[PDB]
Design an enzyme around this catalytic site. Sequence first.
Site, mmCIF file in Angstrom:
data_model
loop_
_atom_site.group_PDB
_atom_site.id
_atom_site.type_symbol
_atom_site.label_atom_id
_atom_site.label_comp_id
_atom_site.label_asym_id
_atom_site.label_seq_id
_atom_site.Cartn_x
_atom_site.Cartn_y
_atom_site.Cartn_z
ATOM 1 N N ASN A 1 0.853 -1.176 0.000
ATOM 2 C CA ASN A 1 0.000 0.000 0.000
ATOM 3 C C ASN A 1 0.898 1.238 0.000
ATOM 4 O O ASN A 1 1.499 1.572 1.027
ATOM 5 C CB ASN A 1 -0.923 -0.009 1.219
ATOM 6 C CG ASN A 1 -1.807 1.241 1.305
ATOM 7 O OD1 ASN A 1 -2.852 1.321 0.654
ATOM 8 N ND2 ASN A 1 -1.356 2.239 2.064
ATOM 9 N N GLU A 2 0.991 1.914 -1.151
ATOM 10 C CA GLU A 2 1.439 3.309 -1.251
ATOM 11 C C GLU A 2 2.930 3.462 -1.011
ATOM 12 O O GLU A 2 3.364 4.391 -0.331
ATOM 13 C CB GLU A 2 0.651 4.234 -0.311
ATOM 14 C CG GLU A 2 -0.732 4.535 -0.801
ATOM 15 C CD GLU A 2 -1.417 5.633 -0.009
ATOM 16 O OE1 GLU A 2 -0.821 6.117 0.988
ATOM 17 O OE2 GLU A 2 -2.555 6.017 -0.389
ATOM 18 N N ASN B 1 -5.271 4.549 -4.886
ATOM 19 C CA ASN B 1 -5.985 5.275 -3.835
ATOM 20 C C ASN B 1 -6.269 6.691 -4.332
ATOM 21 O O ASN B 1 -5.344 7.394 -4.759
ATOM 22 C CB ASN B 1 -5.145 5.319 -2.557
ATOM 23 C CG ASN B 1 -4.781 3.925 -2.041
ATOM 24 O OD1 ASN B 1 -5.542 2.978 -2.192
ATOM 25 N ND2 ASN B 1 -3.657 3.828 -1.350
ATOM 26 N N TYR C 1 -8.632 15.307 -0.503
ATOM 27 C CA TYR C 1 -7.302 15.887 -0.568
ATOM 28 C C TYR C 1 -7.171 16.612 -1.903
ATOM 29 O O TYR C 1 -6.461 16.192 -2.813
ATOM 30 C CB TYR C 1 -6.243 14.812 -0.400
ATOM 31 C CG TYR C 1 -6.256 14.120 0.941
ATOM 32 C CD1 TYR C 1 -5.769 14.752 2.083
ATOM 33 C CD2 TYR C 1 -6.729 12.824 1.071
ATOM 34 C CE1 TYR C 1 -5.768 14.101 3.317
ATOM 35 C CE2 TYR C 1 -6.735 12.178 2.307
ATOM 36 C CZ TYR C 1 -6.256 12.819 3.410
ATOM 37 O OH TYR C 1 -6.270 12.165 4.611
ATOM 38 N N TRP D 1 -12.630 3.907 1.624
ATOM 39 C CA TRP D 1 -11.928 4.234 2.853
ATOM 40 C C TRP D 1 -12.822 5.192 3.636
ATOM 41 O O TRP D 1 -13.005 6.339 3.206
ATOM 42 C CB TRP D 1 -10.577 4.874 2.554
ATOM 43 C CG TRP D 1 -9.670 4.779 3.711
ATOM 44 C CD1 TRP D 1 -9.375 5.762 4.597
ATOM 45 C CD2 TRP D 1 -8.914 3.634 4.106
ATOM 46 N NE1 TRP D 1 -8.494 5.300 5.534
ATOM 47 C CE2 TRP D 1 -8.189 3.994 5.253
ATOM 48 C CE3 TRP D 1 -8.776 2.347 3.596
ATOM 49 C CZ2 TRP D 1 -7.345 3.106 5.907
ATOM 50 C CZ3 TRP D 1 -7.961 1.474 4.236
ATOM 51 C CH2 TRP D 1 -7.244 1.851 5.382
ATOM 52 N N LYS E 1 -12.909 8.970 8.290
ATOM 53 C CA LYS E 1 -13.517 8.700 6.991
ATOM 54 C C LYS E 1 -14.375 7.456 7.002
ATOM 55 O O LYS E 1 -14.729 6.949 5.933
ATOM 56 C CB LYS E 1 -12.451 8.595 5.894
ATOM 57 C CG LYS E 1 -11.521 9.801 5.860
ATOM 58 C CD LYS E 1 -10.961 10.024 4.478
ATOM 59 C CE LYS E 1 -9.883 11.104 4.516
ATOM 60 N NZ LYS E 1 -8.554 10.507 4.894
#
Lengths: 660, 660
Positions: free
Chosen positions: A394-395, A445, A451, A530, A551
Amino acid sequence: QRQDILLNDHWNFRFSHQVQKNTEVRVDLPHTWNAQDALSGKPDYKRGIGNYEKKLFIRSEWQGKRLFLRFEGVNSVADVFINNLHIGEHRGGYGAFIFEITGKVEYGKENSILVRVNNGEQLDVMPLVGDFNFYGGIYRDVHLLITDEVCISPLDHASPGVRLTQDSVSHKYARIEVLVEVSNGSDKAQEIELGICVRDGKRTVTERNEKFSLSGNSDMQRRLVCEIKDPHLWNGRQDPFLYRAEVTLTRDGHVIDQVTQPLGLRFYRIDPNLGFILNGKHLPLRGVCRHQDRSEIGNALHLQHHEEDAALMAEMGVNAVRLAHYPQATCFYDLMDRYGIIVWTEIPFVGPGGYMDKGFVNLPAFRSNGKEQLRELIRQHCNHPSICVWGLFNELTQAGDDPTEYIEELNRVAKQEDMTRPTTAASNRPATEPMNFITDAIAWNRYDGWYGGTPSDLGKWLDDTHKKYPELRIAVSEYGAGASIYHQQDSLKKPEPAGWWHPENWQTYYHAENWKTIASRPYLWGSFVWNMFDFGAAHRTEGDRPGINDKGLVTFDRKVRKDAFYFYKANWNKEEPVLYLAGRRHTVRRQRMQTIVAFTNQPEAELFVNGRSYGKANPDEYAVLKWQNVTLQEGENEIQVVSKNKELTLSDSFRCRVES
Amino acid sequence: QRQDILLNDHWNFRFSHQVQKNTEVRVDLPHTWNAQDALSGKPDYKRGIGNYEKKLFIRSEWQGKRLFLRFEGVNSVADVFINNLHIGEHRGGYGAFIFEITGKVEYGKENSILVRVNNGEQLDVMPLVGDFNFYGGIYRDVHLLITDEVCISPLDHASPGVRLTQDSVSHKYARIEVLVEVSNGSDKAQEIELGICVRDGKRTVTERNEKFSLSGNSDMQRRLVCEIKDPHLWNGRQDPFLYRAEVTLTRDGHVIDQVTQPLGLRFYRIDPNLGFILNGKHLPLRGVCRHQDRSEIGNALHLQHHEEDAALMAEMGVNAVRLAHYPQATCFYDLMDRYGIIVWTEIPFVGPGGYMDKGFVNLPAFRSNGKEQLRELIRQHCNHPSICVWGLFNELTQAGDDPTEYIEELNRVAKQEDMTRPTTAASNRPATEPMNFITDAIAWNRYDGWYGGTPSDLGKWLDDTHKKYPELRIAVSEYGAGASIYHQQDSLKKPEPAGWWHPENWQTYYHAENWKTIASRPYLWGSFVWNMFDFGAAHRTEGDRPGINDKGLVTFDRKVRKDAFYFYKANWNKEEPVLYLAGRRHTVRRQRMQTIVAFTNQPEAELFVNGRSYGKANPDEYAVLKWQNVTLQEGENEIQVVSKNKELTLSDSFRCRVES
Ligand SMILES: [Cl-]
Ligand SMILES: [Cl-]
């Protein structure tokens, strides 16, 4: 025959930083020591060594059997002692792990179990960073296993010792291969009977057994094969059918050991333009993400808590889940099996996102440990029908230490362990980065409208990417928006994400538009919200209190469904009637004229404001009822929405006040 | 034409220990700054000064009107500023207070309210000690009131400006004396007309009106006497009828100001031998206590939190409540009015109990401040019909500074303010202490069978006290036992109260024995469970987590009703069906032989153990079903109870595991 004894009750605990004697205190497993400091919003919560001690009487009759201590989770690093002699170390906060204590105890006596757990920082045990809490402790169950000296072995990566692999699955035929670890702990060679019986309740569907010889103090693997003609397929929530598969060891007749496991037969493929095809039929993955914590107790979850999280997703119409960002508990995978919810589960190879430092550090220990963590994940949970992809990161970033080489290595490790399920990953890289092209599936994502940007940015980005790499299988790993149920205001205006004000109406708006964007694009093999629940992240300083990622569609205590939950319930759950006004928690308003919004899966609803009708209306394509220019009156108002459909009459209403 | 405007939105907040220029963050009232540190179990949570600053545009159109800021609750000591000039101080964390700002503001321009709040320790502002949290801040609403220059004054101790005294109430006749504070803020004398209109729905029951002249810059207190033939009496939960009483000011035929207040007519007495008699009928007071906090938010409660708390008591069959240990919210008093729940409410003159230091320090400012807190209690909340006694202290000690004289002063003050309501107090003093004999009714906090002793000790002590002092009006003001819902075992075994182990089954046993004791003694005019809910007490180190008093019948988040709740609900609620197996959270058992216990308000019920019927049984006098010598299986069992009373078939069941 074989015994499984829960060892959670009555341990003694102290921090190694409590260096004086008589400082131990009673705890009762499951247990984390960060349920107070981390949940309160302290970013420097307690990360280091905690010491659990248990007194366990080893019965005389148990001598001649084999004894194992299985741990289902201990964050992060564990060193185990029997009567204060080290027996083993385990590095990794989320796979189960095991140790045999047959040769290490004094039969007929009390013995000492000592577990020194460390959750302090390391650069060589993933995850290194992450937007969540690294709760330290024995936070899952602990069991004493007693088996025959000849047994189906639990020692291989703390797997069940039975591994059920599916090929050639169709509506007409299925082949199941059964890998069994068998261990002879006696000093004598043994002639045993090994058998597999696959059952529908108590009806045998197939059966094969085999007699073979095994020398003393030796173990080998056996791979049996059986077939099923016209198998009852596991078909998601339409029909989550489950065989039980029982493997037995026999000796001179009579069973000496037994292991049972689920078998759910399904075939599926991920299509670059059609999305996810389950048993030959297309299936939108209506997904949410889920973390394994809860208010007041952190990640020291009990069974009923897993069950409740499952029920809430089932209620909302979820049929897919991403279990972020780590291997989770067997009994949650169980519930997803039994509900028919498709599972994305991943190893904790988590990058920094918008925060500092890195998720990959080029250390031999880190790389090596990562491969053992991925091997734990697949060998321990591969039998679950609900698991359908294996996630690998993840990321991560390619800047600094570049993990692309290592990811390719992990991808190959996954294929060695499991050819039958695609690999995936959750990226936040520009599409050009090589790490997006390794796994069988890929996903991004995206928070367009949280954002920064606006929701329309999302569909354009996905469209463009799908065009430039037509062979990618694209999904949305994450999309969501913050919301406090105590932050209300009349107008939609984009809050600052990093601030102390997340008004609920913007989360609603965000998911409305975003689900519209996802639902117009069949090439996406799934989308994952999310998050399903607010979850602990001790470093957050935003919303209505610090330490929370807000969230979630439901609150951190699982008490309050936010408006957006009912939006997804209107769209995804076409079985239970839904008629739900939005903004019920906006109870003090400053405007007289409002836009009123409800969510329904009924054909028609009519709005009433102080008994005065504002007309019938039908939901749009995405279950939204909307009346603009609704004049309220100064002071108190009552707002009611009503729907009739033959015998079914539904109603929802709330009160509010207008000041100025 | 009167205006009331909520000011909870977007205040700027900073602590005074933050010395730097731009350290302000946004908050939204209700607010406490101890939501995270105190509830985390930090005993030295922030006790000191925080600063709230709000910018308010003072409309040009408001000149010629009068402007008030009313704070319903700021803990502990407030200093209000307008445009950074000091305008007043309030010492006390639990009573409303008000400041007129008519002459402090610049009309037509933006003005700044600053509130400097202190909850740091003091020795001269009760409460000085207590088993609970002193959450600092503006934890209740803030209102801007806008009235005509001639108005029904809201200035006298933040009262409503309308006092409805029930000076004679019967089934045939009722006399109500209305005192109205009028104020002429203009500099010309004014001819106004005063009106009181008592309504049952839209119907005028009585009206009374009078004309007079009032001089400029002048106040006077008008008294109107009203009668009601054959009044509809507020009769508790059987019929909590409420008249509306609206008071108007009129000038040249037009209404210029109005305040409406609740009026419930009832008469009652407290008999030393017979208990509590409401409107002629004996009423047992089936009661609990309630603190004003909740998980995660602390005491910064919203309306829905008040409403749920009250619905939970109503569901359980509560008909009385002791609001401990301080004046509570108007909103909550209104709920008890509407539910019919008799209210004991007290000033926060709280003693140390088993802890250190003192409830009473013989300082002159402590004493005068206490009298003002008691006047605030009576004058603000006197109109609520549910309130029936006023409490003057909780667990003071005569050792050191003796409060007994000062308690006599307080009792005198109460009677100056209200001759219609008896005074009471909550003692842990041996009965011989004179401070037990000041108030009209007395009550002790007893924990026989928790803090040592067995429950039967309670009745012995009660009976003896009753016999020695046959003219005392005795209630039981506290009785309880802690329980974690996560702590379970097989045998009833008295836990150590201060230890990390409060098995739920003891609380169940405890309350079933003490209700039996209480239920048999009609000389007890009431009994109050400590406590309805688990509540915050930072200093605590017991139960399943620090910072928690766990004697609640319902958990701190209001999500889980403990077993004892259903014990009371089966006894007390006779309108909703109850069929509740006890022990459902004891899922892992060590012993195959069990006693199965259930609570019901149905005539009879049948137990099934793995489909095997253990025969029908009947509740006892206290609603307890019990099946002795129930034999469970090794491994998984299922336990189910069924009751049929056509047309009504009820069922309850749960799953446990036996594992010797
Ligand atoms: Cl990285
Ligand atoms: Cl005292």
